[PDB]
Design a binder for these strands. Structure first.
Lengths: 53, 329
DNA sequence: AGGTAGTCACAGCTGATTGCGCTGAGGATTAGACGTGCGATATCTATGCCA
DNA sequence: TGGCATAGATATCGCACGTCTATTATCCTCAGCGCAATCAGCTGTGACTACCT
């Protein structure tokens, strides 16, 4: 997303605390709905590229 | 204003950061962007820059344009950048305000009166033949791995440990540092330098008397804090950085009580391989220290090496070492 | 036949190269509740005191 | 004969003594940038030779 300069944020889900501190817990990235499938295509391309790399 | 310990810029009377934190051309973290906006909005009565010799670099020079401050003051140990990019610095910050006489400060006892020495190490015939055979930049490994140089360093370490001295050994080459420290079985710090374990090793040197021999890579220049020491042994250097290793010597050796009356209370050794290009570097480098009146007495041979048993006594070990070195081209 | 411009063979200047350092994203990581144990404490009534 | 104090018998509520899972913002790693002595190619200069007079 940053490579393609797409505004992507984390998706704060809850809180986890292993040693006594409530770190926020995120599940995936929130993005704009317009680039949803474009981001999927980019992820597929990068997955294949990293496989061959 | 670092990436690890983050603090609110508001109400921060004195903000401490690094050039990289201001030199990030790439996108920073979102909070970092806000702090940079706060800094740019705020106008500073005073700005302080440390290690001025690194400023003339283009990215760090852009920082001065980035920040709007009234009074900028620079402090450092040296001002001779080997790329002669110092004339511009005269207007990047301003005129050189002051420069204390090193020998005068030695006389006043504000700093230790250093005992400088350059130790010449003969080249093994096989090593020297290989060194002459190669003509490119790859020659660095061979003379930095001179068996006689290894023996000299080992003898110095043994002698100063028997004297109970703080031994810090520098080696700019990564591979040479690893091999030397491992064979001598002493702590080594290089590129990885896990900061927690780095400070662990530093405190072990500071507090544990059993371990008083620390091997440090090029990161010992400015990447961390050097505890005060008394014996500094430099094996490999950048290759002409007359200011870098002189600054390393100045930072390593500090004022120590007990031997202030004596004119030699700090000991510095520079190992140089004979008939190599390294000699041409050393005379090129210590020139800066000559400008401060420091002298370097040539020590071709070390007294006492014969009786004490050292490594590589047999050449059969030395040819295996040559095998190892040539394996890495 | 005569001399200085075109052409080729070497020199200074500077950019690319190769060791090495640093941030940003990314994947790992005992304080009110709920009871009881002990301890201070309200609590109810036999019953014989002598008017 | 009868009014009721005075202590025997008994829980009773308060203060104090055990556990328990979370009314909310960490710790290392790899990729992306940077810095300083070679080395090599662009450009300048001299040696050798062509052409107009």
């Amino acid at each position: 997303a940053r490579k393609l300069d797409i505004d992507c944020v984390q998706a704060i889900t809850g809180f986890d605390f292993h040693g006594g501190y409530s770190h926020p817990v995120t599940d995936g990235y929130i993005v704009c709905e317009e680039f949803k499938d474009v981001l999927l295509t980019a992820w597929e391309n990068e997955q294949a590229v990293i496989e061959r790399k | 204003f670092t990436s690890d310990a983050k603090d609110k810029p508001i109400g921060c009377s004195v903000a401490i950061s690094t050039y990289s934190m201001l030199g990030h051309t790439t996108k920073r973290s979102w909070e970092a962007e806000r702090v940079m906006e706060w800094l740019k909005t705020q106008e500073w009565g005073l700005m302080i820059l440390d290690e001025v010799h690194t400023i003339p670099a283009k990215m760090f020079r852009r920082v001065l344009t980035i920040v709007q401050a009234h009074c900028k003051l620079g402090l450092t140990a040296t001002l001779v950048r080997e790329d002669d990019k110092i004339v511009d610095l005269n207007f990047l910050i301003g005129p050189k305000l002051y420069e204390a006489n090193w020998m005068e400060l030695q006389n006043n006892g504000y700093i230790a009166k250093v005992q400088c020495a350059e130790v010449w190490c003969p080249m093994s015939p096989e090593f020297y033949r290989e060194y002459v055979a190669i003509k490119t930049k790859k020659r660095i490994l061979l003379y930095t791995m001179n068996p006689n140089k290894f023996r000299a360093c080992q003898f110095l370490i043994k002698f100063h440990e028997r004297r109970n001295d703080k031994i810090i050994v520098f080696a700019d080459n990564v591979f040479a540092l690893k091999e030397y420290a491992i064979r001598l079985n002493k702590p080594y710090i290089y590129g990885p330098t896990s900061q927690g374990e780095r400070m662990q090793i530093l405190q072990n040197f500071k507090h544990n008397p059993k371990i008083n021999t620390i091997f440090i890579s090029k990161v010992g220049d400015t990447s961390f804090d050097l505890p005060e020491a008394n014996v500094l042994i430099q094996i490999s250097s950048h290759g002409g950085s007359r200011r870098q290793e002189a600054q390393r010597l100045g930072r390593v050796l500090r004022a120590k009580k007990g031997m202030v009356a004596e004119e030699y209370n700090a000991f510095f050794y520079s190992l140089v391989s004979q008939d190599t290009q390294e000699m041409a570097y050393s005379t090129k480098r210590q020139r800066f220290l000559v400008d401060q009146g420091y002298s370097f007495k040539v020590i071709t041979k070390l007294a006492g090496m014969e009786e004490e048993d050292l490594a590589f006594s047999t050449k059969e070990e030395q040819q295996q070492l040559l095998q190892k070195v040539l394996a890495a081209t």
